[PDB]
């Protein structure tokens, strides 16, 4: 048995490498490095923070105050929020408008404050990739990001620019182009409690910036498709996911190194695993992330998977195969064009062309026990991760959001044992990158806010 001989010889090999618990167990170099550890400074940014907010089953779920404030902007795309240590929120749309909200009036719907709308006036007079230093967006703003301190919001989209606006007036303070032709930005994330931005640009590139210095730190390379989502916490690590290469990478940005995590679910072995006694299959494209803590994260796929990954395992720890359902099959009055229902039913091939909803938004509350998933099934899902950190489980649903969920994130309130949050979710009737979405089933372009309690 050749793989048995491989495992056996590898075991003998590791035993021989060990060859080349007592009462005294102290090692001189380890305790010397621990003396240097006692000598050093800056136990602030580099907390390898584990899950210290265990509250998944604690708070209420089923009776949230859900207000779906519809807004008149075609296809809202992103949502950025802010809390100091009054709270503002930000939305941005495919109609080239950024909009500031106040959200701190917690028991009611948010309040519009200020527009900032680019348009055809901001097309540059050059068509030349480094004099892209205009003051507004002329194409398809895809992402906003508020500063952790709140001086600025920074936004960008398919016009390959980063425009950083002031908070108090929504004015463009600085323009930083991405200096090449395909340099469309797709996701932005500040590292927490900082002034450092991580943008993920479709050149298979990740750009980093210091916003209050108007400088770019480091460009870091290495995905294989467009870097569709990004996520960061207080550590200088980052977690990006490229779309169709089906890998999620995490980046030690000062070292400029990474850990890659591929997928790897196969319907052959999965249907055999069920065949030991079923509509589930392989993977299209890993789409969204959120780093839950500094040892784990969660990925949202294109076949409706939500997966939970550790920092110490290439293959994922936990899967959840169907997370928002399978799409309604196309009707017999809109598949075939024959006359009889028998042939128009034969043109469905049974179950072979039922496609699942793909999770287009995922948000893990940082270091907490609970994350929120959203797609165009109409109902957001709330999941909590078990305390042994090897599984998660569906708590409840938030069914007042008709449309695609282009963004989810939460806003905190309450103290250490009694808490209430408003879950913002940007709702559109069209995916945040291309159109591709038919059967617009009662959708509206709005902000689904929910107020969850206890």
Partner 1 sequence: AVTIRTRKVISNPLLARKQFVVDVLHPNRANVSKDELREKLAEVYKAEKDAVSVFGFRTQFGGGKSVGFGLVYNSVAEAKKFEPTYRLVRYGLAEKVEKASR
Partner 2 sequence: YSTPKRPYESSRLDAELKLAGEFGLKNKKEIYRISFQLSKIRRAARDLLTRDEKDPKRLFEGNALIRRLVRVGVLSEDKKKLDYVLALKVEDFLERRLQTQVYKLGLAKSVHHARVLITQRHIAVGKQIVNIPSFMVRLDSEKHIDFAPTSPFGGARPGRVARRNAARKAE
Partner 3 sequence: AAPHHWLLDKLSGCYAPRPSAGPHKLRESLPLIVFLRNRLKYALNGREVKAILMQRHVKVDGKVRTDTTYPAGFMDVITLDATNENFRLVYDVKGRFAVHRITDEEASYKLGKVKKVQLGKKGVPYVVTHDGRTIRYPDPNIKVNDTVKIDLASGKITDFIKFDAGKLVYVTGGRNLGRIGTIVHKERHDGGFDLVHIKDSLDNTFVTRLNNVFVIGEQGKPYISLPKG
Q: Which residues in this chain contact RNA in the complex, by CB under 7 A?
A: 67-73, 109, 112, 400, 402, 440, 442, 444
71 binding partner (options partner 1, partner 2, RNA, none; Cβ < 5 to 8 Å by kind): RNA
Name the strands in the sheet holding 392-398, side by side, starting at the edge strand that comes first in the sequence.
361-364, 370-374, 380-385, 392-398
Residues 6 or more apart in contact with residue 178 via CB below 8 angstroms: 160, 161, 162, 184, 185, 201, 203, 207
Binds partner 3 (CB under 8 A): choice among 20, 27, 42, 255: 27
Binds partner 3 (CB under 8 A): choice among 12, 32, 166, 454: 32
Q: How far is the CB of 268 from partner 3 (least distance, A)?
A: 47
> Which of 179/346 has CB closer to partner 2?
179
**Window 371-430: residues binding partner 2 (CB under 8 A):** none
Q: 25 vs 1, 18, 21, 28, 30, CA distance in Å?
A: 40, 17, 8, 10, 11
DSSP per-residue letters across 259-296: EEEE----HHHHHHHHHT-----------EEE--SSSE
Q: How far is the CB of 83 from partner 1 (least distance, A)?
A: 27
> Which of 30/255 has CB closer to partner 3?
30
- Binding interface with partner 1 (CB under 8 A): 36, 39-42, 210, 213-218, 254
> Which of 178/379 has CB closer to partner 1?
178
Angle at 160 between CA 156 and CA 163, to 5 degrees: 40
Contact indicator for 150, 84 with CB cutoff of 8 Å: yes
Binds partner 2 (CB under 8 A): choice among 41, 128, 276, 352: 128
> Which of 181/415 has CB closer to partner 2?
181
Q: How far is the CB of 105 from RNA (least distance, A)?
A: 12
Handedness of CA 336, 342, 347, 351 (dihedral sign): positive
* C-alpha to C-alpha distance for 197 and 260, rounded to whole angstroms: 21
Binds partner 2 (CB under 8 A): choice among 61, 173, 175, 219: 219
Handedness of CA 321, 57, 411, 66 (dihedral sign): positive
Residues engaged in binding partner 3 (CB under 8 A): 21-32, 35-36, 38
User: In the complex, which residues of this chain contact partner 2 (CB under 8 A)?
Assistant: 2, 5-6, 9, 128-130, 179-181, 203-204, 219, 221-222, 224
């Amino acid at each position: 048995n050749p793989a048995d001989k491989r495992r056996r010889l590898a075991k003998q090999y590791l035993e021989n490498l060990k060859s080349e618990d007592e009462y005294n167990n102290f090692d001189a170099g380890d305790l010397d490095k621990d003396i240097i550890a006692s000598r050093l400074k800056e136990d602030v940014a580099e907390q390898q923070g584990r899950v210290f907010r265990y509250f998944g089953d604690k708070l209420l779920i089923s009776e949230a105050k859900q207000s779906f404030t519809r807004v008149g902007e075609n296809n809202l795309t992103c949502i950025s929020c802010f809390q100091p240590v009054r709270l503002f929120a930000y939305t941005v749309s495919k109609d080239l408008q950024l909009t500031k909200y106040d959200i701190t009036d917690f028991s009611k719907r948010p309040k519009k404050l200020k527009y900032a709308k680019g348009g055809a006036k901001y097309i540059p007079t050059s068509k030349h990739e480094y004099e892209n230093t205009t003051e507004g967006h002329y194409d398809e703003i895809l992402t906003v990001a508020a500063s952790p301190d709140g001086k600025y919001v920074v936004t960008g989209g398919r016009d390959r620019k980063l425009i950083v606006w002031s908070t108090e007036s929504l004015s463009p303070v600085k323009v930083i182009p991405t200096k090449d032709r395909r340099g469309e930005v797709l996701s932005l994330a500040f590292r927490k409690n900082s002034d450092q931005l991580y943008a993920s640009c479709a050149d298979f590139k990740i750009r980093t910036y210091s916003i209050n210095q108007f400088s770019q730190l480091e460009i870091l390379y290495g995905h294989h498709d467009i870097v569709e989502d990004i996520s960061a916490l207080a550590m200088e690590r980052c977690v990006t996911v490229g779309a169709r290469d089906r890998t999620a990478m995490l980046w030690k940005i000062p070292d400029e190194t990474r850990l890659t995590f591929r997928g790897g679910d196969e319907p052959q072995k999965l249907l055999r695993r069920w065949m030991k006694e079923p509509l589930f299959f392989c993977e299209g494209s890993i789409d969204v992330v959120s780093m839950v803590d500094d040892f784990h994260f969660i990925t949202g796929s294109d076949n409706g998977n939500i997966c939970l990954w550790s920092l110490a395992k290439k293959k994922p720890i936990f899967t959840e195969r169907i997370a928002h359902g399978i799409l309604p099959e196309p009707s017999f009055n809109d598949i075939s064009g024959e006359t009889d229902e028998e042939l128009r039913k034969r043109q469905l091939q049974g179950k072979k062309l039922l496609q699942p909803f793909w999770i287009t938004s995922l948000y893990a509350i940082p270091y907490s026990n609970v994350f929120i998933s959203g797609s165009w099934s109409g109902s957001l899902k709330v999941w909590k991760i078990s305390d042994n950190l090897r599984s998660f489980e569906l708590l409840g649903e938030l069914s007042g959001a008709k449309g695609v969920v282009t963004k989810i994130q939460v806003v905190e309130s309450g103290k250490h044992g009694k808490e209430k949050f408003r879950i913002l979710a940007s709702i559109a009737k069209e995916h945040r990158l291309g159109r591709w979405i038919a059967n617009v089933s009662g959708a509206r372009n709005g902000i689904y806010s929910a107020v969850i309690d206890q």
